[PDB]
Scaffold this active site. Structure first.
Site, PDB file in Angstrom:
ATOM      1  N   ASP A   1      -3.938   9.691   6.477  1.00 11.94           N
ATOM      2  CA  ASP A   1      -5.179   9.055   6.887  1.00 11.94           C
ATOM      3  C   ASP A   1      -6.356  10.012   6.749  1.00 11.94           C
ATOM      4  OD1 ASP A   1      -3.855   6.741   7.404  1.00 11.94           O
ATOM      5  OD2 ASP A   1      -4.200   6.727   9.569  1.00 11.94           O
TER       6      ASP A   1
ATOM      7  N   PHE B   1       0.859  -1.177   0.000  1.00  7.62           N
ATOM      8  CA  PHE B   1       0.000   0.000   0.000  1.00  7.62           C
ATOM      9  C   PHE B   1       0.897   1.230   0.000  1.00  7.62           C
ATOM     10  CE2 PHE B   1      -3.341   2.906   1.525  1.00  7.62           C
ATOM     11  CZ  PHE B   1      -4.413   2.453   0.783  1.00  7.62           C
TER      12      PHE B   1
ATOM     13  N   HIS C   1       0.453   7.666   2.042  1.00 13.38           N
ATOM     14  CA  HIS C   1      -0.835   8.336   2.162  1.00 13.38           C
ATOM     15  C   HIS C   1      -0.924   9.045   3.506  1.00 13.38           C
ATOM     16  CE1 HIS C   1      -1.608   4.559   4.322  1.00 13.38           C
ATOM     17  NE2 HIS C   1      -2.501   5.255   5.002  1.00 13.38           N
TER      18      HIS C   1
ATOM     19  N   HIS D   1       2.603   7.701   5.738  1.00 17.22           N
ATOM     20  CA  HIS D   1       3.065   6.356   6.041  1.00 17.22           C
ATOM     21  C   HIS D   1       2.635   5.414   4.926  1.00 17.22           C
ATOM     22  CE1 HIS D   1      -0.893   7.042   7.734  1.00 17.22           C
ATOM     23  NE2 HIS D   1      -1.127   5.743   7.760  1.00 17.22           N
TER      24      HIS D   1
HETATM   25  C1  LIG Z   1      -2.583   1.308   7.221  1.00 20.35           C
HETATM   26  C2  LIG Z   1      -3.583   0.298   7.769  1.00 20.35           C
HETATM   27  C3  LIG Z   1      -4.521   0.957   8.768  1.00 20.35           C
HETATM   28  C4  LIG Z   1      -4.363  -0.400   6.639  1.00 20.35           C
HETATM   29  N1  LIG Z   1      -4.770   0.545   5.612  1.00 20.35           N
HETATM   30  C5  LIG Z   1      -5.982   1.110   5.603  1.00 20.35           C
HETATM   31  O1  LIG Z   1      -6.872   0.804   6.392  1.00 20.35           O
HETATM   32  C6  LIG Z   1      -6.214   2.203   4.560  1.00 20.35           C
HETATM   33  C7  LIG Z   1      -5.166   3.290   4.756  1.00 20.35           C
HETATM   34  S1  LIG Z   1      -5.295   4.150   6.345  1.00 20.35           S
HETATM   35  N2  LIG Z   1      -7.552   2.755   4.684  1.00 20.35           N
HETATM   36  C8  LIG Z   1      -8.436   2.752   3.683  1.00 20.35           C
HETATM   37  O2  LIG Z   1      -8.224   2.197   2.608  1.00 20.35           O
HETATM   38  C9  LIG Z   1      -9.723   3.492   3.952  1.00 20.35           C
HETATM   39  C10 LIG Z   1     -10.849   2.587   4.432  1.00 20.35           C
HETATM   40  C11 LIG Z   1     -12.103   3.363   4.823  1.00 20.35           C
HETATM   41  C12 LIG Z   1     -13.343   2.447   5.025  1.00 20.35           C
HETATM   42  N3  LIG Z   1     -13.593   1.565   3.871  1.00 20.35           N
HETATM   43  C13 LIG Z   1     -14.572   3.296   5.345  1.00 20.35           C
HETATM   44  O3  LIG Z   1     -15.640   3.144   4.787  1.00 20.35           O
HETATM   45  O4  LIG Z   1     -14.349   4.183   6.269  1.00 20.35           O
HETATM   46  C14 LIG Z   1      -3.550  -1.530   6.032  1.00 20.35           C
HETATM   47  O5  LIG Z   1      -2.923  -2.321   6.710  1.00 20.35           O
HETATM   48  O6  LIG Z   1      -3.603  -1.560   4.727  1.00 20.35           O
HETATM   49 FE   LIG Z   2      -3.061   5.016   6.986  1.00 20.54          FE
END
Ligand SMILES: CC(C)[C@@H](NC(=O)[C@H](CS)NC(=O)CCC[C@H](N)C(=O)O)C(=O)O
Ligand SMILES: [Fe+3]
Length: 329
Positions: free
Chosen positions: A214, A209, A212, A268
Protein backbone atom coordinates in the site's frame (compact mmCIF):
# COMPACT_ATOMS: atom_id res chain seq x y z
CA UNK A 1 -4.73 -26.06 -0.50
CA UNK A 2 -5.36 -22.56 0.94
CA UNK A 3 -5.26 -21.76 4.66
CA UNK A 4 -6.68 -18.75 6.51
CA UNK A 5 -4.75 -15.86 8.02
CA UNK A 6 -4.89 -14.90 11.69
CA UNK A 7 -6.61 -11.50 11.74
CA UNK A 8 -7.44 -10.47 15.32
CA UNK A 9 -10.35 -8.19 16.13
CA UNK A 10 -9.08 -5.36 18.35
CA UNK A 11 -11.43 -3.26 20.46
CA UNK A 12 -10.06 0.22 19.73
CA UNK A 13 -12.53 2.17 21.88
CA UNK A 14 -9.93 2.81 24.65
CA UNK A 15 -7.98 4.93 22.15
CA UNK A 16 -10.70 7.59 22.48
CA UNK A 17 -10.63 7.61 26.30
CA UNK A 18 -8.37 8.69 29.14
CA UNK A 19 -7.41 5.30 30.63
CA UNK A 20 -3.71 5.15 29.76
CA UNK A 21 -3.15 1.50 30.73
CA UNK A 22 -6.12 0.35 28.65
CA UNK A 23 -4.61 2.18 25.66
CA UNK A 24 -1.31 0.35 26.22
CA UNK A 25 -3.10 -3.01 26.06
CA UNK A 26 -4.59 -1.93 22.72
CA UNK A 27 -1.13 -0.88 21.51
CA UNK A 28 0.22 -4.32 22.44
CA UNK A 29 -2.43 -5.92 20.23
CA UNK A 30 -1.51 -3.62 17.34
CA UNK A 31 2.17 -4.47 17.83
CA UNK A 32 1.37 -8.19 17.79
CA UNK A 33 -0.81 -7.96 14.67
CA UNK A 34 1.68 -5.67 12.90
CA UNK A 35 4.49 -8.16 13.59
CA UNK A 36 2.49 -11.23 12.50
CA UNK A 37 0.49 -11.06 9.25
CA UNK A 38 0.11 -7.27 9.31
CA UNK A 39 -3.70 -7.13 9.35
CA UNK A 40 -6.20 -6.64 12.16
CA UNK A 41 -9.87 -5.70 12.42
CA UNK A 42 -10.77 -2.57 14.37
CA UNK A 43 -14.04 -3.12 16.23
CA UNK A 44 -16.07 -0.79 18.46
CA UNK A 45 -15.03 2.05 16.14
CA UNK A 46 -18.24 4.07 16.41
CA UNK A 47 -18.68 4.74 12.68
CA UNK A 48 -22.11 4.02 11.20
CA UNK A 49 -21.08 1.68 8.39
CA UNK A 50 -24.66 0.72 7.49
CA UNK A 51 -25.28 4.29 6.31
CA UNK A 52 -21.89 4.18 4.59
CA UNK A 53 -22.79 1.11 2.53
CA UNK A 54 -26.32 2.32 1.79
CA UNK A 55 -25.38 5.79 0.51
CA UNK A 56 -22.47 4.37 -1.50
CA UNK A 57 -24.79 1.85 -3.17
CA UNK A 58 -27.45 4.42 -4.10
CA UNK A 59 -24.74 6.56 -5.70
CA UNK A 60 -23.06 3.74 -7.64
CA UNK A 61 -26.33 2.34 -9.00
CA UNK A 62 -27.93 5.68 -9.96
CA UNK A 63 -25.07 7.50 -11.71
CA UNK A 64 -25.40 7.66 -15.50
CA UNK A 65 -22.73 7.49 -18.23
CA UNK A 66 -23.22 11.24 -18.78
CA UNK A 67 -22.31 12.03 -15.17
CA UNK A 68 -19.33 9.65 -15.28
CA UNK A 69 -17.78 11.55 -18.20
CA UNK A 70 -18.22 14.89 -16.41
CA UNK A 71 -16.46 13.54 -13.29
CA UNK A 72 -13.85 11.42 -15.09
CA UNK A 73 -10.16 11.77 -14.24
CA UNK A 74 -7.73 12.70 -17.02
CA UNK A 75 -7.04 9.01 -17.72
CA UNK A 76 -10.57 8.73 -19.17
CA UNK A 77 -11.23 12.38 -20.14
CA UNK A 78 -8.51 14.40 -21.85
CA UNK A 79 -10.32 17.63 -20.93
CA UNK A 80 -9.74 17.18 -17.19
CA UNK A 81 -5.94 17.49 -17.00
CA UNK A 82 -6.26 18.74 -13.40
CA UNK A 83 -8.01 15.53 -12.27
CA UNK A 84 -5.20 13.08 -11.59
CA UNK A 85 -6.56 11.76 -8.26
CA UNK A 86 -10.09 13.06 -7.64
CA UNK A 87 -12.93 12.09 -9.95
CA UNK A 88 -14.56 9.01 -11.43
CA UNK A 89 -12.68 5.90 -12.55
CA UNK A 90 -14.90 4.52 -15.30
CA UNK A 91 -15.32 0.83 -15.97
CA UNK A 92 -15.00 -0.46 -19.54
CA UNK A 93 -17.86 -2.84 -20.46
CA UNK A 94 -16.37 -6.11 -21.65
CA UNK A 95 -12.84 -5.12 -20.62
CA UNK A 96 -12.82 -3.63 -17.10
CA UNK A 97 -15.31 -4.50 -14.37
CA UNK A 98 -14.29 -2.24 -11.50
CA UNK A 99 -15.22 1.42 -11.17
CA UNK A 100 -14.62 3.86 -8.34
CA UNK A 101 -14.97 7.44 -7.14
CA UNK A 102 -12.09 9.13 -5.31
CA UNK A 103 -12.26 12.36 -3.32
CA UNK A 104 -9.74 14.18 -1.16
CA UNK A 105 -9.58 16.58 1.79
CA UNK A 106 -12.77 18.69 1.57
CA UNK A 107 -10.69 21.68 2.72
CA UNK A 108 -8.81 21.70 -0.61
CA UNK A 109 -10.59 24.67 -2.23
CA UNK A 110 -9.45 27.31 -4.73
CA UNK A 111 -8.63 29.52 -1.72
CA UNK A 112 -6.36 26.88 -0.16
CA UNK A 113 -2.69 27.95 -0.44
CA UNK A 114 -1.54 24.56 -1.77
CA UNK A 115 -4.12 24.77 -4.56
CA UNK A 116 -3.07 28.33 -5.38
CA UNK A 117 0.57 27.21 -5.43
CA UNK A 118 -0.49 24.27 -7.65
CA UNK A 119 1.34 21.72 -5.52
CA UNK A 120 1.27 18.14 -6.90
CA UNK A 121 -1.23 15.68 -5.40
CA UNK A 122 -3.48 18.57 -4.25
CA UNK A 123 -6.80 18.87 -6.09
CA UNK A 124 -10.27 20.28 -5.51
CA UNK A 125 -12.93 17.57 -5.29
CA UNK A 126 -15.55 17.22 -8.03
CA UNK A 127 -19.09 16.19 -7.11
CA UNK A 128 -22.28 15.22 -8.95
CA UNK A 129 -25.28 17.53 -9.18
CA UNK A 130 -26.96 17.96 -5.80
CA UNK A 131 -30.30 17.61 -7.58
CA UNK A 132 -29.48 14.25 -9.17
CA UNK A 133 -27.70 12.85 -6.07
CA UNK A 134 -29.23 14.71 -3.13
CA UNK A 135 -27.29 14.57 0.12
CA UNK A 136 -24.38 12.58 -1.31
CA UNK A 137 -21.74 15.30 -1.02
CA UNK A 138 -22.80 16.18 2.52
CA UNK A 139 -22.65 12.51 3.49
CA UNK A 140 -19.29 11.98 1.76
CA UNK A 141 -17.61 14.98 3.40
CA UNK A 142 -18.97 14.04 6.83
CA UNK A 143 -17.71 10.48 6.44
CA UNK A 144 -14.26 11.78 5.49
CA UNK A 145 -14.04 13.37 8.95
CA UNK A 146 -15.65 10.44 10.78
CA UNK A 147 -12.97 8.14 9.39
CA UNK A 148 -10.38 10.88 9.93
CA UNK A 149 -11.24 10.68 13.62
CA UNK A 150 -10.88 6.90 13.74
CA UNK A 151 -7.55 7.13 11.91
CA UNK A 152 -6.21 9.72 14.36
CA UNK A 153 -6.93 7.38 17.28
CA UNK A 154 -5.40 4.37 15.52
CA UNK A 155 -2.20 6.36 14.95
CA UNK A 156 -1.97 6.96 18.70
CA UNK A 157 -2.07 3.19 19.19
CA UNK A 158 0.67 2.73 16.60
CA UNK A 159 2.80 5.37 18.34
CA UNK A 160 2.42 3.76 21.78
CA UNK A 161 3.16 0.36 20.24
CA UNK A 162 6.52 1.63 18.95
CA UNK A 163 7.45 3.26 22.27
CA UNK A 164 6.73 6.86 21.25
CA UNK A 165 4.38 9.44 22.73
CA UNK A 166 0.86 9.01 21.42
CA UNK A 167 1.08 12.04 19.08
CA UNK A 168 4.22 10.87 17.26
CA UNK A 169 2.24 10.32 14.05
CA UNK A 170 -0.98 12.25 14.69
CA UNK A 171 0.89 15.57 14.97
CA UNK A 172 1.49 15.26 11.19
CA UNK A 173 -2.10 14.17 10.41
CA UNK A 174 -3.89 17.52 10.30
CA UNK A 175 -7.29 18.42 8.79
CA UNK A 176 -5.98 21.44 6.88
CA UNK A 177 -3.36 19.66 4.73
CA UNK A 178 -3.77 15.88 4.93
CA UNK A 179 -3.42 14.14 1.57
CA UNK A 180 -5.63 11.23 2.69
CA UNK A 181 -8.22 10.01 0.20
CA UNK A 182 -11.50 8.09 0.22
CA UNK A 183 -12.18 5.66 -2.64
CA UNK A 184 -15.68 4.31 -3.27
CA UNK A 185 -15.08 1.17 -5.34
CA UNK A 186 -17.77 -0.99 -6.94
CA UNK A 187 -16.98 -4.60 -7.83
CA UNK A 188 -20.04 -5.56 -9.90
CA UNK A 189 -21.71 -8.87 -10.49
CA UNK A 190 -21.42 -9.52 -14.24
CA UNK A 191 -22.84 -12.40 -16.28
CA UNK A 192 -20.85 -13.19 -18.35
CA UNK A 193 -17.84 -11.83 -16.49
CA UNK A 194 -15.25 -10.43 -18.94
CA UNK A 195 -12.15 -12.63 -19.02
CA UNK A 196 -10.11 -9.50 -19.81
CA UNK A 197 -10.75 -8.24 -16.26
CA UNK A 198 -9.44 -11.43 -14.58
CA UNK A 199 -5.72 -11.90 -13.95
CA UNK A 200 -4.04 -15.27 -13.39
CA UNK A 201 -1.52 -15.36 -10.56
CA UNK A 202 1.73 -17.31 -10.75
CA UNK A 203 0.14 -19.89 -8.43
CA UNK A 204 -2.94 -20.17 -10.67
CA UNK A 205 -5.26 -18.05 -8.51
CA UNK A 206 -7.63 -15.83 -10.48
CA UNK A 207 -7.22 -12.20 -9.41
CA UNK A 208 -8.93 -8.87 -9.86
CA UNK A 209 -5.88 -6.96 -8.56
CA UNK A 210 -2.31 -8.23 -8.35
CA UNK A 211 0.02 -8.27 -5.35
CA UNK A 212 1.19 -4.92 -4.01
CA UNK A 213 2.26 -2.86 -1.02
CA UNK A 214 0.00 0.00 0.00
CA UNK A 215 1.01 3.59 -0.73
CA UNK A 216 0.04 4.96 2.68
CA UNK A 217 1.07 5.30 6.29
CA UNK A 218 -1.83 3.02 7.27
CA UNK A 219 -4.88 1.84 5.32
CA UNK A 220 -8.37 1.92 6.87
CA UNK A 221 -10.67 -0.25 4.78
CA UNK A 222 -14.36 -1.15 4.94
CA UNK A 223 -15.71 -3.96 2.75
CA UNK A 224 -18.99 -5.79 2.34
CA UNK A 225 -19.22 -9.37 3.58
CA UNK A 226 -17.58 -11.11 0.62
CA UNK A 227 -14.23 -12.84 1.09
CA UNK A 228 -11.69 -11.52 -1.41
CA UNK A 229 -8.43 -10.36 0.20
CA UNK A 230 -5.30 -12.49 0.59
CA UNK A 231 -2.15 -11.70 2.57
CA UNK A 232 1.27 -13.07 1.65
CA UNK A 233 3.24 -15.00 4.27
CA UNK A 234 6.43 -17.03 4.06
CA UNK A 235 4.30 -20.11 3.29
CA UNK A 236 2.19 -18.57 0.53
CA UNK A 237 -0.95 -16.47 0.39
CA UNK A 238 -3.60 -16.80 3.10
CA UNK A 239 -7.27 -15.83 2.94
CA UNK A 240 -8.54 -12.91 5.02
CA UNK A 241 -12.01 -13.64 6.37
CA UNK A 242 -14.53 -10.87 5.74
CA UNK A 243 -16.29 -8.84 8.43
CA UNK A 244 -18.71 -6.07 7.44
CA UNK A 245 -19.01 -4.64 10.98
CA UNK A 246 -15.37 -3.62 11.44
CA UNK A 247 -12.48 -1.92 9.69
CA UNK A 248 -9.53 -3.85 8.27
CA UNK A 249 -6.24 -2.13 9.14
CA UNK A 250 -2.76 -2.52 7.68
CA UNK A 251 0.44 -0.51 7.32
CA UNK A 252 1.75 1.05 4.12
CA UNK A 253 5.25 1.30 2.73
CA UNK A 254 5.77 4.62 4.54
CA UNK A 255 5.43 2.91 7.92
CA UNK A 256 7.84 0.20 6.76
CA UNK A 257 10.27 2.94 5.74
CA UNK A 258 10.33 4.97 8.95
CA UNK A 259 10.50 1.87 11.19
CA UNK A 260 13.30 0.28 9.14
CA UNK A 261 10.87 -2.53 8.23
CA UNK A 262 10.00 -3.35 11.85
CA UNK A 263 6.36 -2.95 10.79
CA UNK A 264 6.44 -4.47 7.32
CA UNK A 265 4.03 -3.34 4.62
CA UNK A 266 2.17 -6.63 4.05
CA UNK A 267 1.94 -7.74 0.43
CA UNK A 268 -1.67 -8.54 -0.43
CA UNK A 269 -3.82 -9.19 -3.50
CA UNK A 270 -7.50 -9.32 -4.46
CA UNK A 271 -8.95 -12.65 -5.55
CA UNK A 272 -11.57 -12.70 -8.30
CA UNK A 273 -15.13 -13.13 -7.06
CA UNK A 274 -18.19 -12.69 -9.29
CA UNK A 275 -20.26 -10.92 -6.65
CA UNK A 276 -21.71 -7.44 -6.22
CA UNK A 277 -19.62 -5.97 -3.40
CA UNK A 278 -18.09 -2.75 -2.06
CA UNK A 279 -14.48 -1.89 -1.19
CA UNK A 280 -14.15 1.50 0.55
CA UNK A 281 -10.56 2.33 1.52
CA UNK A 282 -9.43 5.42 3.39
CA UNK A 283 -5.70 5.93 2.81
CA UNK A 284 -4.03 7.69 5.75
CA UNK A 285 -1.59 10.15 4.18
CA UNK A 286 0.29 12.98 5.87
CA UNK A 287 0.97 16.52 4.69
CA UNK A 288 2.96 17.23 1.56
CA UNK A 289 5.87 18.55 3.66
CA UNK A 290 5.46 16.09 6.54
CA UNK A 291 8.73 14.33 7.44
CA UNK A 292 9.19 11.75 10.20
CA UNK A 293 12.78 10.85 11.04
CA UNK A 294 13.31 7.09 10.54
CA UNK A 295 14.22 4.90 13.50
CA UNK A 296 14.75 1.24 14.40
CA UNK A 297 12.86 -0.23 17.38
CA UNK A 298 15.19 -3.25 17.36
CA UNK A 299 18.19 -1.08 18.24
CA UNK A 300 18.50 0.21 21.83
CA UNK A 301 19.51 3.64 20.54
CA UNK A 302 16.87 3.57 17.80
CA UNK A 303 19.54 4.71 15.35
CA UNK A 304 18.76 4.07 11.68
CA UNK A 305 20.78 4.79 8.53
CA UNK A 306 17.70 5.57 6.41
CA UNK A 307 17.21 8.95 4.78
CA UNK A 308 14.19 10.98 5.91
CA UNK A 309 11.50 10.90 3.25
CA UNK A 310 9.18 13.81 2.51
CA UNK A 311 5.65 12.44 2.34
CA UNK A 312 4.86 14.56 -0.72
CA UNK A 313 7.62 13.00 -2.81
CA UNK A 314 6.76 9.57 -1.42
CA UNK A 315 3.09 9.84 -2.39
CA UNK A 316 3.78 11.32 -5.83
CA UNK A 317 6.22 8.59 -6.85
CA UNK A 318 4.19 5.93 -5.05
CA UNK A 319 0.91 6.52 -6.88
CA UNK A 320 2.64 6.56 -10.27
CA UNK A 321 4.58 3.36 -9.59
CA UNK A 322 1.43 1.54 -8.46
CA UNK A 323 -0.26 2.40 -11.77
CA UNK A 324 2.68 1.19 -13.87
CA UNK A 325 2.83 -2.11 -11.96
CA UNK A 326 -0.84 -3.04 -11.47
CA UNK A 327 -2.49 -0.78 -14.06
CA UNK A 328 -5.02 2.02 -14.27
CA UNK A 329 -7.98 1.51 -11.94
C1 LIG B 1 -7.22 -3.42 -1.76
C2 LIG B 1 -8.42 -2.49 -1.71
C3 LIG B 1 -8.20 -1.37 -0.71
C4 LIG B 1 -8.76 -1.93 -3.11
N1 LIG B 1 -7.56 -1.54 -3.83
C5 LIG B 1 -7.11 -0.28 -3.84
O1 LIG B 1 -7.73 0.66 -3.33
C6 LIG B 1 -5.76 -0.04 -4.50
C7 LIG B 1 -4.72 -0.93 -3.82
S1 LIG B 1 -4.45 -0.52 -2.08
N2 LIG B 1 -5.37 1.35 -4.41
C8 LIG B 1 -5.11 2.11 -5.48
O2 LIG B 1 -5.26 1.71 -6.63
C9 LIG B 1 -4.60 3.50 -5.18
C10 LIG B 1 -5.69 4.56 -5.19
C11 LIG B 1 -5.18 5.93 -4.76
C12 LIG B 1 -6.19 7.07 -5.04
N3 LIG B 1 -6.66 7.08 -6.44
C13 LIG B 1 -5.59 8.42 -4.66
O3 LIG B 1 -5.62 9.39 -5.38
O4 LIG B 1 -5.04 8.41 -3.48
C14 LIG B 1 -9.57 -2.93 -3.91
O5 LIG B 1 -10.49 -3.57 -3.44
O6 LIG B 1 -9.17 -3.04 -5.15
FE1 LIG C 1 -3.68 -2.55 -0.87
Amino acid sequence: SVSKANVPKIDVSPLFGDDQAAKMRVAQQIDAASRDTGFFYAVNHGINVQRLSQKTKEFHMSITPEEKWDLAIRAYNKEHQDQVRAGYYLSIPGKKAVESFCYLNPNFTPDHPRIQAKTPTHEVNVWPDETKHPGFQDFAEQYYWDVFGLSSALLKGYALALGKEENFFARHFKPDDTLASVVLIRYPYLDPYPEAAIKTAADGTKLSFEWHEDVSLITVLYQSNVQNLQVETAAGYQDIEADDTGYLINCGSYMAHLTNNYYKAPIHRVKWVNAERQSLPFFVNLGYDSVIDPFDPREPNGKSDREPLSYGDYLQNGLVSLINKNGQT
